[PDB]
Design a protein around this ligand. Structure first.
Ligand SMILES: N[C@H](CCC(=O)O)C(=O)O
Ligand SMILES: [Zn+2]
Lengths: 303, 61
């Protein structure tokens, strides 16, 4: 399997199944729902066993950000390859389970690979009258739903949908998290801009855990930087990128999940969403150092 | 000079202006602190409306 190339959804699913079959005592596949076009929403669960808290990690909520899905897939392989050898991932997995959703919007991903390379949204049909397709799945969460930075126009790239959790992909994630009940970190991957962010996107005020989330984000950005010299900027969503009501980490934080972070991966605009395949591996490797720093902090600070 | 953010169907644009504000054709616009990306790209002063503005845009990311 070549982790340094973009793959079709069929290729991704096969590799997820190959991972499970070659590491049965550590990885399992959990289906949490289905897409609008009825494709299975499969999460990989990494666990050493026992009733324990968990970290949620997702990628590809926006179809066109192909470096995210590729990074999530390489990350799955990196956990299984390093478990038992690297002391840090080994001790992380003694304390916590990791849930990883590589392709959060499978319908959009396939549409972007076959018809439109810039597609962002889901592929649901609009309940109007509308002639436009799809909802922005990162404006559909119940956290300042409908506010600034989200549109009521179905033809917009930031359309919020008719109501919070209208998209089955999003409702499938919310239902899993609420049923699980012990999720302690929520991390979502987007591309581009090179930013490591924490709540609020729906408002520009400081959240209660500002000082701790800022320090954790700065430490992760530091660790990321050390491999290839790539520099990230850190801050709340609202001030470092833009206001964006109805986002996932605003929902997770307000639900009580304190370590809620968002990455904008590589690049800063030279290639944008069309990141060369030659940059997949360098992007995934350095992102792993940032991810590991955040998970170490979750491991060391139970709540 | 005041700084603004405008939401459009396919992109987000910031405007840094002196003696003007974005026109209604620029989308849904309100005053907003500048973000990192805005300062980097909005480098040139151009005649805008009744004044002058610097502007740059990014896609929803
Ligand atoms: N447009 C945003 C990027 C970061 C965010 O606002 O949370 C998103 O919804 O993907
Ligand atoms: Zn995105």
């Amino acid at each position: 399997f070549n982790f340094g190339a973009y793959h079709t959804l069929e290729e991704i699913s096969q590799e997820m199944d190959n991972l499970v079959a070659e590491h049965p005592g550590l990885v399992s596949k959990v289906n949490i729902g289905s897409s609008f076009e009825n494709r299975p929403m499969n999460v990989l669960k990494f666990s050493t066993g026992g009733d324990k808290p968990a970290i949620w990690l997702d990628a590809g909520i926006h179809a066109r950000e192909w470096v995210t899905q590729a990074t999530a897939l390489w990350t799955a392989n990196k956990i299984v390859s390093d478990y038992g050898k690297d002391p840090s991932i080994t001790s992380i997995l003694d304390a916590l389970d990791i849930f990883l959703l590589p392709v959060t919007n499978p319908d959009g991903y396939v549409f972007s690979q076959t018809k439109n390379r810039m597609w962002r949204k889901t592929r649901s049909k609009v309940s109007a009258g509308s002639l436009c397709v799809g909802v922005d799945p990162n404006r559909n969460w119940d956290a300042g739903f409908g506010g600034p930075g989200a549109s009521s126009n179905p033809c917009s790239d930031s359309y919020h949908g008719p109501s919070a959790n209208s998209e089955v992909e999003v409702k499938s994630i919310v239902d899993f998290i609420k049923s699980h009940g012990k999720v302690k970190a929520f991390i979502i991957l987007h591309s581009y801009s090179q930013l490591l962010m924490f709540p609020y996107g729906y408002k520009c005020t400081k959240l209660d855990d500002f000082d701790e989330l800022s320090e954790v984000a700065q430490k992760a950005a530091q660790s990321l930087s050390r491999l290839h010299g790539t520099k990230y900027k850190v801050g709340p969503i609202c001030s470092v990128i833009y206001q964006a009501s109805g986002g996932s980490i605003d929902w997770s934080y307000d639900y009580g999940i304190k370590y809620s972070f968002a990455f904008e991966l590589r690049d800063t605009g030279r290639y944008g969403f069309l990141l060369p395949a030659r940059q997949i591996l360098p992007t995934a490797e350095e992102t792993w150092l940032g991810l590991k720093a955040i998970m170490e902090h979750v491991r060391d600070h139970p709540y | 000079d005041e700084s603004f953010l405008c939401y459009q169907p396919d992109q987000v644009c910031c405007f840094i202006c002196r003696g003007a504000a974005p026109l209604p054709s620029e989308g849904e616009c309100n005053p907003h602190p500048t973000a990192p990306w805005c300062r980097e790209g909005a480098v040139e002063w151009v005649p805008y409306s009744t004044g002058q503005c610097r502007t740059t845009c990014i896609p929803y990311v």
